[PDB]
Symmetry: D2
Subunit: 297 residues, 4 copies
């Protein structure tokens, strides 16, 4: 299979179920809204060793927000409900309630399940909290240094997907990295999705467990490490490839992960030096969500 003149292996990505809450952060302008979102979603690449998986989803124009100001929608992910509930409180309470000019609202107003993050954080007012309605949302005003911080009572969450992905293989590292940046920019416009790794790009890659150091939970996936292909049997790196990068995608549903994957691949293949596009899986075992690349075009 070829896409934009680039070879795309007819294989699949294997994803997993995960809980995801969608939050809307607004501010004076996009800069301040972003300052808060970025801080609240850092240290959030993988649940392997990060408190959660998080990222900025998409910008929100004044015409679409409750208070009529510019903002950003962000996603915070965790394997368990209580875990996600815990992440929302810590991240929004330590990184957004404390950020300049911010106000937070529910990013999934029609969600089945929701947690009372607003009700809990408002206790920060130590008794001076007030109740207010902003564009129809029921909120709380928390008096503090800059003025009144406004936060909706609840935040909705849903059963999403984590681990959507695709690999980019190229002739040099720069070519692979530029293809990966293109993919991330392209994916940034896709609603309902995020790319949690640094800059949204994975430079490491991984395999469950290890072959030598059994005391590890995950190690380098030597079969996709170009610098040691001569030393690895059954290596998946072609003779002309010197570098590989992966794009990991978390999303509210399968259709969104699928669109993100197509959009990302389409853009990546525009960069000279790209040799091959494929994706990572676990042989059909472990995963519950499978994305077949040949079904994307």
């Amino acid at each position: 299979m070829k896409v934009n003149g680039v070879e795309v292996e007819e294989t699949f990505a294997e994803a997993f179920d995960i809980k995801i809450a969608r939050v809307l952060i607004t501010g004076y302008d996009y800069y301040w809204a972003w300052v808060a979102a970025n801080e609240a979603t850092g240290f959030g690449t993988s649940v392997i060793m990060c408190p959660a998986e998080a990222g900025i989803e998409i910008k929100a124009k004044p015409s679409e927000t409750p208070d009529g100001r510019p903002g950003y929608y962000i996603q915070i992910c965790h394997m368990s409900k209580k875990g996600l509930e815990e992440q929302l409180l810590a991240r929004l309470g330590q990184c957004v309630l404390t950020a300049p000019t911010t106000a937070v609202f529910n990013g999934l107003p029609d969600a089945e399940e929701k947690d009372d993050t607003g009700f809990k954080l408002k206790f920060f007012a130590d008794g001076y909290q007030k109740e207010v309605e902003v564009g129809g949302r029921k909120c709380w005003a928390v008096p503090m240094m800059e003025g009144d911080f406004i936060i909706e009572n609840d935040i909705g969450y849903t059963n999403g997907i984590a681990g959507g992905n695709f690999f980019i293989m190229a002739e040099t590292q720069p070519s692979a990295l530029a293809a990966a940046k293109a993919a991330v920019d392209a994916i940034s416009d896709v609603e309902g999705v995020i790319t949690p790794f640094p800059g949204g790009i994975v430079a490491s890659g991984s395999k469950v467990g290890a072959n030598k150091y059994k005391f590890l939970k995950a190690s380098t996936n030597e079969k996709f490490a170009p610098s040691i292909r001569d030393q690895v049997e059954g290596t998946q790196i072609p003779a002309g490839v010197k570098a590989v990068y992966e794009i990991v995608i978390n999303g509210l549903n399968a259709d969104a992960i699928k669109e993100a994957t197509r959009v990302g691949i389409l853009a990546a293949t525009k960069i000279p030096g790209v040799v091959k596009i494929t994706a990572g899986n676990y042989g059909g075992k472990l995963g519950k969500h499978i994305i077949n690349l040949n079904e994307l075009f």
Copy 2:
């Protein structure tokens, strides 16, 4: 005291003791280094509910790096040795070892005490790791998708200070925010320091524990909340002040904290609308380090 025509209260900031590790991250250019530093230092405003207090210290020119590539020094802070070693492994292992083009070196080559974070993280190579020396530093090469990740064997840490600060009072919110942003920019050029909060700015402010909710580790500092000055008897908000913002500073030592405080105030007072400058403190024997504002100007 008067600085640039503005009223500065002759009081003090009450800082606390904290462990600080200094890490140098390099990459192709400033953008890629920043991407790694940014991800690794997020969700790190306060130890009250964040896994640590982190932030970008200063830009590192190629002329000053072991590999001759552009980079950034970052600081990761924690109250104890185990937690810091812990945060170093998690943030660097999940946010820097995974980010494109990066290499990590000891940001405090000197310093007696250090953690062997490099030695532990190299196990990720599962036996394919190799020793290599870069710019006179003992590092490890970890094969992965992008190529080889280079990391020094050890990272140094020292007894630093967290909690240096000053408050900015203005006639309107935008005026207080503009001065706060001006302070953050000026402080960015100061070596050995970081401003942990979002955008480096504190919009909330906190006090003892709580009046009504003793189940809170901290609550709003109502005495500095202009929106409720009326129903507050010991309010520290002068009549015409409608907004306040705080700047928290963490750093390697007192001289650095004092420099950052001085530089931030000088810049803050250039903004129209600023009426008063002060600092926050508590019980004498509660915070070890005191920073008297009257000794900085």
Copy 3:
């Protein structure tokens, strides 16, 4: 008349006729496309002393571009046809054909009037040009150091409007500025419009000639200068106002100018400290296009 609680004067803006060309610039990703668009539209705030009035209109998603890669649409304006053709060849030839990874396409495909800028610039190939069709567009490939620069044969231009506007009055300079920045951000999502001044904001403001220096083509509009209200008898500055900022808007048609004016004001009035909103005119004796604030809300 009040908007969001802020008073809006029931007056009008007086704009003028101008020629406008719309160009699409694409690259590896948004950064590189922005690099070219930013350089090409610089030194272009006003026709009084700049070679032209220009600016970045809006983002162009990969799904909307002829080549499927990210980009930005920009507008370049001039009073005459000859002057506009000249500015297209100079700005695109010197600032886009020379920038990394770009390609340029016709941003107004259905316009009847066009300039053959592509045809002229391709001579730079000195005999090595080659014709190529991209996404249905007739183009030329120009080999140079980086590879081949792709540029459509021509660019469409239309009769647009310059000078759409509104003034923002506030209690402090930071308040008026934050409001203006809020409006610029909101207006950045509006199609068919550009905000030509630095950061899209007018900090000066001007009037036809000059009372004391008749050799000037324009001078400060004293009736709107806060700092000297006590020395100007016809001052239009209310008592509590210390700073004013203007937002100038150029665009393809009246409906666009109108939408931008409306969205800008809505955003601006969300900033604390804003006291009044109005607009600039010249008695209706100069501009053909009048924008009544009354009809926007």
Copy 4:
């Protein structure tokens, strides 16, 4: 010759004499100072068809400016005195005097040759002009909408150099581009120099006249165009190079150009895929300034 393992041809760069004025622009913070500098330095890549060659030189810290505010130093270049005098009036009067919060000062106080830019632009005040002294500099306050614009009345200039350069050849377009990017970032820290092309990088390149279209004053240097190497018959592009990027350097003196050239090359050779490093000249006849690469290392 080898630098960081990369082959560096033992040739030279051939530069020319040009008039350069240095201007300091300050604002509330680095963001606002940048907005004005950016706008004022755009549409300025080459005097061939641009009004001038301009760019941002280096950041200016509060401790270094006359008003104690953050800012940026920019360079505006022109071949003649009067052309330079005019470019200062237009760019600064149209792009800085109009940008939010700015103040301008002389960037070369010790230069005997100076232009009275400030004295002429203050006529904008139409009589309400007022003299003020800031940090020892003699300036003018010009009343306007945002308040009072402060500008020193004189701006110095000197006989500088235009055309410093070196070429980066790589196996892929992304490889050469990342190399040139790194070089620009590395040069941004060098005092007294600027990189005038888009993002500071030249993707085109050129030769004096033309081989086929003689009415042209310049055209593609086909001997350095990778895409037509099989054709040229005089190509200077080695078999394995697919793309080339050039970095043009302008500066106050020779020492500075050399430092910038050295700094750029060193950083560029750090990027994987770079094959060769050389520079552009004209047989040593056209330009007066020669920079031999072999004497920089």
